[PDB]
Amino acid sequence: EKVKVYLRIRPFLTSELDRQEDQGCVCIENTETLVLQAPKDSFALKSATHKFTFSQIFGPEVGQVAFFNLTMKEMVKDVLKGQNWLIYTYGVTNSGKTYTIQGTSKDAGILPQSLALIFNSLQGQLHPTPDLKPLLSNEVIWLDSKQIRQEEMKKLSLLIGGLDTVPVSVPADIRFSVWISFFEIYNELLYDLLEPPQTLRLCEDQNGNPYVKDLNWIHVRDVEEAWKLLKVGRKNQSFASHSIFSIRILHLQGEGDIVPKISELSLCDLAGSTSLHTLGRCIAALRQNLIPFRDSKLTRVFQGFFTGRGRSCMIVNVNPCASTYDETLHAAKFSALASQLVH
């Protein structure tokens, strides 16, 4: 029950349905079992049935709002209450990964819907001044006038690109500060995406916890600012991989004498096709019970989610096509809870 795996199967295109791509390769036996079969009429010149277990399987008919409510809504609510959530996303060729993550202007993905829910819930309870920065998952730094002015300019340079969800309940006595970071892991090297268009170093805490040194945490006042930073972040990624987008909420309880608390909602966009192999070993060891999180930079970044300082889950996007069967079988073998070979 540790790392829940959700499978989302993309609907068939009218074009792909005509190219004989529907051969019964991807089948939902039940809400937890995916049945994979080799194509009937092979696209390659030639002449296997596999069963896979997932936490829940959401078929092609499952829309954006329904998918969000059945998976993400509870996790975003958990984060608003004080817990830490990490959502891994998987997909290689035309899987529906980006439609699930960001989506269209109307059919908004899990990331815009989460940001919308956060700001709808925290509405009228936001701490105006970006006074305290959650530089660490457990620590806050105080910013002076010079530092606030400097952080505002970096934010402004990004926003100008250089040169209805029903809310969740939150206690009335708390004030909130929302901060965002966005970085990429390209060939074991870390790159900041919230930098106006150089690598980042992974350092150990004063208590032994790793963190990304000099990574930009941008204070966000509303959903429009958060959305723009994701767009600017993806534009920088497209200018130049594992895409890590983090939302950190600073909770300020009480009047006069304040008690600060930090919660986090992180989304990891895993690259298709070694770091993936270590993550598999790390998730398996986490579900089992030491975890070999140091054997990779990706698992070192998310050390907190393997040491009990947060909860993890995975969303796997699948292409139902017969030409992508071989890619679907690797994705299933990698992400599934259990795997059976039908004899």
Residue numbers in the entry: 62 to 108, 116 to 231, 286 to 319, 326 to 368, 379 to 411, 431 to 446, 455 to 508
Q: What did the study's authors say about this model?
A:
We obtained a 2.7 Å resolution structure of a microtubule-unbound murine KIF20A fragment (residues 55–510) comprising the MD and the first residues of the NL. Overall, the MD structure displays a typical kinesin fold with the MD in the open conformation, which is generally not observed for isolated kinesins. Instead, this open conformation is one of the conformations observed when kinesins are bound to a microtubule or tubulin. Close to the P-loop, a sulfate ion is found at the position normally occupied by the nucleotide β-phosphate. (c) The open NBS of KIF20A MD alone (X-ray structure) showing disordered switch loops. The difference is due to a bias in the β6-L10-β7 conformation in the X-ray structure that is involved in crystal packing contacts. The common interactions between L6-N and MD core residues are particularly well defined in the crystal structure, showing multiple hydrophobic contacts, especially in the βL6-βL6′ region (bottom). We also found that addition of 5–10 mM Mg2+·ADP did not disrupt the possibility to crystallize KIF20A in the same conformation. No nucleotide density or ordering of the NBS was visible in the electron density maps in this case. No ADP was visible in the nucleotide binding site of the resulting model, which was thus refined against another native crystal dataset obtained in nucleotide-free conditions.
